Structures are given as C-alpha cells and as structure tokens.
Write a protein that binds this ligand. Structure first.
Ligand SMILES: CCCCc1nc2ccc(-c3cc(N)nc(N)c3)nc2n1CCCC
Ligand SMILES: [Cl-]
Length: 335
C-alpha cells in the first residue's frame, strides 16, 4: 500500500543482499545500505517508488548511467558507478557503489564557515573534468540538478568526489521537465524560459564552488523572482540581446522607452551589480568574513584567480560562459 517498498533492517533479498539500514529518502524513493554477498562489499541500493513518473525518470537514469559506463576514459570515474539494476517486490532497484558524505554535509561539519580554497580547488578541478566527460558529443548529458547534495566524497578522509542522481537529466536539445535545476543553482537561461544546453551545469558549478568556500548559498532565492533578483544584485541586469529573446523576461524585467532593461518592482534589493563577488569572497579582506586572514593557501593572488574563474562560470550568455576544457586550463588550477 503506497509508493514505498517496506524495508526492515535485517532482511536478505534474493539471497544476495543483506539489508542493514535506510540511509536516506528523496522524491524518487529510498536509498538503503546493504552487503552484496557475490561481490563481497557494501552497496547503496536506490529503490524507485512504484509510480509511472518515478519509474520513467529512473529508466532514463539507467540508460544514461549505462551509456557513460561504456566509455573507456578515466574521466568516467567522476560519475557514480551503477553496479546492477533489477525489479524486486514491484520496484526498480539501482545498485550503486557505496560513497560517503555529500558536500552539504561537509559544509555542515565546518558549521557553514566553508572549506579551504585548497579543497575548493580540488572539488572544482574534479567537477570541471566530470562536466568535460558529460560534454563528450556521443554523451552530451545535461545533469540538470547539480547541488552540494548531489556531489559525494568517495571516502570520508579523501578529496575524491563523484556526481550522483541523473533522475532529472536529459541530452542536448531535449525539453522533458517543466521546471529544472534546484532553485539556488538554476541558470538565468532556465529562469528566462530560453533554450538550455550543457552550459546550465557550469552555472550550477560556479554557485556551488562559492558556497563551498563561504559556507552559504551565493543566490538563496525563495522563489524564481527572488532568485533572479539575488542574481542581479551580484551580476547586474542581463544583456539586452538575451532579454530581447527571453519568453519570461517580463516575469522579472521591464523594457524602457530607450530600449534599456531594468528590474520590475515585486509588490528591498541592493542596486544591480553592487553586491560584488570581490567582497563576497573577501579577496583583499582575508577571505569570507575575514576568517582566512594570514592562513597559507589564501593569498590575494589565489582569490583573484578563484573570483575570475567563478565570474567566467557565471557569464549571463551561455554561448560565452566558460566550457569545461577551457575551465581546466585556468590559472586557478596551475601547480
Ligand atoms: C554512507 C552514506 C551513503 C553514501 C551514498 N552512497 C551512494 C551511492 C549512490 C547514491 C545515489 C545515486 C543516484 N544516482 N541517485 C541517488 N539519489 C543516490 N547515493 C549514495 N549515497 C548517499 C545516500 C543517499 C541519501
Ligand atoms: Cl516567483
């Protein structure tokens, strides 16, 4: 009775999996920790709800994960490994390798004061390599839900990360879901109802990397109008050539007699472009809240390279927004 599978700690499925506990829940269903007796290892089992819409998303996730696993690059190891899938008690079950804390858990463990720029750079370098993998023409996968929660440590005392959850994903040119991206990480082009490509994931990554170092969301909107207003505080009014083509431009902006755009009033924001990323990152003032003052690996030069890469990932124009190959060549990553 209901969407969920009933799970009692202690049960053993198909005399292969011993169920230990429920790690977590989500929109899609349940994740349980279990021991795979034939592979001799812990696995995370994603149990999809018995409902057409969740079954359908999971069936795309299986196809995209099996497509990615076919590739013979080392870059594929930045994406969670789907061991197996099977039907059991009327639920699609996806058997994953067992990973560790998500990046949101990391932030919580720092009490939301942020991780070091040194660890930020290691996460950024791996995420740019994962996005470069996804942009493989034969893949051309848009994750569509990048957020700190969907990026997991492989092991709790190492820097190595992987991306999870391709439930909302599509391939270049597809339009499947009415709304896409988690609101804090949602690109201007999705807010504006414009066509979206792999650049929307680069937008999400920019936002994620700032949060990981400051401890707080860059753009914490409570609704789409609040989201776009918080973006404008930092980045200014979007270019006219974008707003002139945007189906939902008039949800956030008004075009003036001159042909200049500015913000609609809502019916309490800093003037456009005056909440500088330079001051959010504390480039010249000791990093976020001054907390990194003196500390090694937190110099003005380091911060300027970080700021400059983030602003290339947060370009309003998805045609000119930095692409994964060029992001990897950035001075921020030089040894
Ligand atoms: C030790 C604590 C558990 C670590 C872990 N290993 C995981 C492996 C895969 C997935 C996962 C994969 C996909 N494609 N979609 C979702 N939604 C979750 N999730 C994992 N998790 C997180 C637990 C889920 C709350
Ligand atoms: Cl709204």
């Amino acid at each position: 009775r209901g969407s969920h599978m009933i799970v009692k700690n202690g049960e053993k499925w198909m005399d292969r999996y011993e169920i230990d506990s429920l790690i977590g829940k989500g929109s899609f269903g349940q994740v349980v920790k279990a021991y795979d007796r034939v592979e001799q290892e812990w696995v995370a089992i994603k149990i999809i709800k018995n409902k057409k819409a969740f079954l359908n998303q999971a069936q795309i996730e299986v196809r995209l994960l099996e497509l990615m696993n076919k590739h013979d690059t080392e870059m594929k190891y930045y994406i969670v490994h789907l061991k197996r899938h099977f039907m059991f008690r009327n639920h699609l079950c996806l058997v994953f390798e067992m990973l560790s804390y998500n990046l949101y858990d990391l932030l919580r463990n720092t009490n939301f004061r942020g991780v070091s720029l040194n660890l930020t750079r290691k996460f950024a370098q791996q995420m740019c390599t994962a996005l470069l993998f996804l942009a493989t023409p034969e893949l051309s996968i848009i994750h569509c839900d990048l957020k700190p929660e969907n990026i997991l440590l492989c092991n709790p005392k190492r820097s190595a990360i992987k991306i999870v959850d391709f439930g909302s994903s599509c391939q270049l040119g597809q339009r499947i879901y009415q709304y896409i991206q988690s609101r804090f990480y949602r690109s201007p082009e999705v807010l504006l109802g414009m066509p979206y490509d792999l650049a929307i994931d680069m937008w999400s990554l920019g936002c994620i990397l700032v949060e990981m170092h400051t401890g707080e969301p860059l753009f914490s909107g409570a609704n789409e109008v609040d989201q776009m207003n918080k973006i404008v505080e930092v980045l200014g009014i979007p270019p006219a050539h974008i707003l002139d083509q945007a189906p939902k431009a008039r949800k956030f902006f008004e075009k003036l007699p001159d042909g200049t755009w500015n913000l609609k009033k809502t019916k309490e924001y800093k003037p456009p472009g005056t909440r500088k990323l330079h001051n959010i990152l504390g480039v010249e003032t000791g990093g976020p809240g001054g907390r990194r003052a003196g500390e090694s690996g937190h110099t003005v030069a380091d911060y300027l390279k970080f700021k400059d890469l983030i602003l290339r990932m947060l370009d309003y124009d998805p045609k000119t927004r930095i692409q994964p190959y060029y992001a990897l060549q950035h001075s921020f990553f030089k040894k």
